Amino acid sequence: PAIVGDEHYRVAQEVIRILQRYKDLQDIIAILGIDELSEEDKQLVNRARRIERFLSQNMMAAEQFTGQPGSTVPLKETIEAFDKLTKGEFDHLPEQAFFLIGGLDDLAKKAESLGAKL
Amino acid sequence: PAIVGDEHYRVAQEVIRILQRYKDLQDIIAILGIDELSEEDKQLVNRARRIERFLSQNMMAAEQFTGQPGSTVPLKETIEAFDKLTKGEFDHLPEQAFFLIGGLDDLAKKAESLGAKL
Amino acid sequence: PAIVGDEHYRVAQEVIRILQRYKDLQDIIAILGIDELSEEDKQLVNRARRIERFLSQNMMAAEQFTGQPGSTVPLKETIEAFDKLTKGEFDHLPEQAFFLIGGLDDLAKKAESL
Amino acid sequence: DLNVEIVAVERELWSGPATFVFTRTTAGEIGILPRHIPLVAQLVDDAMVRVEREGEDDLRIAVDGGFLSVTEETVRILVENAQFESEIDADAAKEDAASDDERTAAWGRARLRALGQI
Amino acid sequence: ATLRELRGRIRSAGSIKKITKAQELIATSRIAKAQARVEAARPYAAEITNMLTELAGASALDHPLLVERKQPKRAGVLVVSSDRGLCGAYNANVLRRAEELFSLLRDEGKDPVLYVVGRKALGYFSFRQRTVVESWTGFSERPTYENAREIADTLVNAFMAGADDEGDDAGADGILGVDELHIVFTEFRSMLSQTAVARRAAPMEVEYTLYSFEPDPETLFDALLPRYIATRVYAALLEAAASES
Amino acid sequence: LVSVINEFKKGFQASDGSSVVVENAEALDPEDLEKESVKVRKPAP
Amino acid sequence: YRELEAFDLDAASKAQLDRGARLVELLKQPQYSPLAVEEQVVAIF
Prior knowledge:
The structure is cut from a larger assembly and holds three copies of chain A, one copy of chain D, one copy of chain E and two copies of chain F.
Chain A: H1 5-24, H2 26-32, H3 39-54, H4 63-66, H5 75-87, H6 104-114
Helix pairs in contact in A: 1-3, 1-5
Chain D: E1 2-8, E2 12-18, E3 20-24, E4 29-32, E5 39-42, E6 48-52, E7 59-70, E8 74-84, H1 90-96, H2 102-115
Parallel strand pairs in D: 1-8
Antiparallel strand pairs in D: 1-2, 3-4, 3-6, 5-7, 6-7, 7-8
Chain F: H1 2-10, E1 34-39
Family (chain C): Belongs to the ATPase alpha/beta chains family.
Subcellular location (chain C): Cell membrane
Protein name (chain C): ATP synthase subunit beta
């Protein structure tokens, strides 16, 4: 927090906590799936899957492979978007809407293409 | 049986059988929970947890680490207490009542401090 | 198929499929019982039992153990026999008829013997 | 002869030919013969059904939630529940009658009528 | 220490496999039993439906339990879920269907009044801070006609009590009821086709020799309607139990 | 210390607004909903 | 018995489970107590 500010630090720590809790459940999920988890764990698992998709990004150097141009995301936009993800303001969009995109504008556009709304 | 007598041997073997069964069921309890066990196995699991706690004891040399003065338990009292445990006599008491105590009087005192009556 | 041909490969794969399905159903049969099974499952179970019994053969080395001498079944005869078995053409014969025999002629002799 | 079918909600109870079907509908006692007119009636709260075949001992059934439906081809008694005389135990029929609850008292009275105590 | 941990994990996984296989076979037998029970129950349903048809054909279809209410404002949704938890997406699908029904009711200006069967739905709705008027549990594995009768009695009592309710007031009754009854449950179409479905049980829509009705067609119709609703609730419970298995 | 702790608890502002003293899922198509009907073997009125 | 010990069974399986429990109890033996072959035959019988 002393260097990146309190907001950046808090959002990053919440992302890490959610992902760690998701990794801890992988044993149960691998055998039984999310259906046996509690409501809190189910919600956290959905949030963590969306977060892990959203950490991906269409890279600039990846255009030669996929043919899609890369994207740049400002730091403030990244912090705000992941803050919303942790709060749960995108829990209704499909997971694939978060795959290989930039900021929140791309998330909204891809959700619209997939039939959801942001 | 030849050296320690029939009662001591029988009680010790029953304790070992119960604890071995509990070790067998540990993984199932962790993954699928307790309700999926048979009523007999649920009874055995409760018995095993209480036996495991009761095998603990507040030792004199350990006072420096816990602040609780140590206790001593005569062999006859130990045999009788564990014979009662393996028979399900103390299944109504909370398992916490059995943690770091001496004989049966200590068990009654700690259960009373927890509300339960031996 | 490039080595043993199309007919041999098809017959062998059909036999393998039937036996694998029977192995899948074995636990249900053992624990809950055959009667519970559906009619198609029972048909497949009968066919698989017949096939597995017919895979047994009277061996040359078995003469010293049982008076019955051994048999040499030509490969094409085996292929056609197991095609017939997988087509359910001998489901009505008793199971014991398929134990420790040779080709189709032996299967007949043992069937009209019972 | 007419096809008596005593049928409950959970399952079917009894079916077969009969020569006489006596019962107590809400309006009053009714005896159904082979060519009775089509009819729909509500059995009394503690109705009892007596079925008489050609030379066989009558079946006396205590019926709760009974509805009688007679047709030229078949006769049916759709019961919420129904218990035969053989299975009816006299002690329960006596003790549950005239209880605090009207439904249970009616059921006990029906059982007594089936036995014969009324 | 890595090898010892791997051996322990292998033992744990083997025990889990044995338990799950035993559960699968037990569930196969349970499915057989549930199908048998459903088939046993079918004839009574057919007979009572025929009798209700006949009574309707010779009666005045003006029962309060049979006419759409005006300015309706409340619906009674019976969500049927399991008690155990090893079903894969049974409860999840049931609750998604229930949520869809709630959204549909909201679009029509109705406030769902929730009734739940089974503990799993209770946990789901407790997590969502949604009031549950009444819940019944413990019999989802093998429901009997007694439980269906009790559920139908409660639901129909609430529905009728909703007759006098005006606005947020409870009317002359003093009990704020509902203007509709819905049951969300898993229909068992096949060994693979288990579908969560919502069904409006009340009010009932009308679809289009002379029998001797005694004492009169109207009394018989009035007595038969609650038993018809209880029968449909029991059928839903049986089919949901089969779907759960 | 216990008295001070209790006095502090008297006016502690919890996170959820409770003292420490002592969705809109997708709608459903009516056509999906199945209605419980009463069969009538008569011409429509 | 080992296959079925994971366990609502048909008659044959329940009987197999009971027989397996009995046989497992049969092979138990106290220390320093060898049995002559005839006694073993009778016990296994």
